[model samples]
Target: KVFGRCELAAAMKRHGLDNYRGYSLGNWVCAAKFESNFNTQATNRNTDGSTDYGILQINSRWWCNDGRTPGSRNLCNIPCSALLSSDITASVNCAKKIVSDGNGMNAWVAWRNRCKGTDVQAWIRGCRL
Candidate 1:
């Protein structure tokens, strides 16, 4: 199983999210847990034959625009193999932007609740992370 604390901390640090409180970290962890089961290498095929890949389950079509080419180290702008690479920052920033234009983690909280059927707020309170 993916170690949530270490991986989440690494991801948060990589994206310059150090200011977040424990609640925010917990919320983000909840999102990651639901998104990829904390698997950095997770990938899934969409009905349209496009793909969602990596830790946050980012859609390759969204990141790449063009179809992903085989053997290319970085898929689109993101290095698919390295989940916390710069491309992951792009995806995190995108999500942050959607959360009131980077004001809060509401978007992440919503994603966790929707995908995992879990209340991120409650988790934050319980875990006190």
Candidate 2:
């Protein structure tokens, strides 16, 4: 499922991502914008034989168990397929784990290149949530 930008903002906030790890809700919304365009089913396979999954694009190499990635740590201890759910609970949880791991938003190159240090409030805009 693809979410409207503000809708995603509200959802992320409800999921406790607002101001999580000193990162604002807008920052997370921005990351999702660039990472997967708010699409729950999004997936990207890397040259390293890992795949990024779900709205936050959590990677298989360290975060999820795809069973195909050669050196997976599966630190999130979740099947990569769970990330594809439109429910987004597992995806949000995994994203939080990634941030809590001290990688912060840097776990996603999309965030670093696009959302980091930007006026991320623009991502949320007039959303009342």
Candidate 1 segments exceeding 4 Å error: 18-23, 65-76, 84-129
Report lDDT (Cα) of residue 8, candidate 1: 61
lDDT against the true structure, each candidate: 0.53, 0.91
Task: Give TM-scores for every candidate, taking all chains together and pairing residue i with residue i.
Answer: 0.55, 0.96
Per-residue CA lDDT of candidate 2, range 4-59, in tens?
A: 99998998998999999999999999999888989999999999889999999998
- Candidate 2 Cα deviation (angstroms), residue 128: 1.7
Q: Candidate 2 — which residues are off by over 4 angstroms?
A: none
* Pairs clashing within candidate 1: none
In the order shown, the candidates' Cα RMSDs to the true structure are 6.1, 0.8
lDDT of 1 by residue, 1-120 (tens): 354555565665567554443235546666667777776667777676666665666654444332454333233354434443434565565444334434455434436456344555
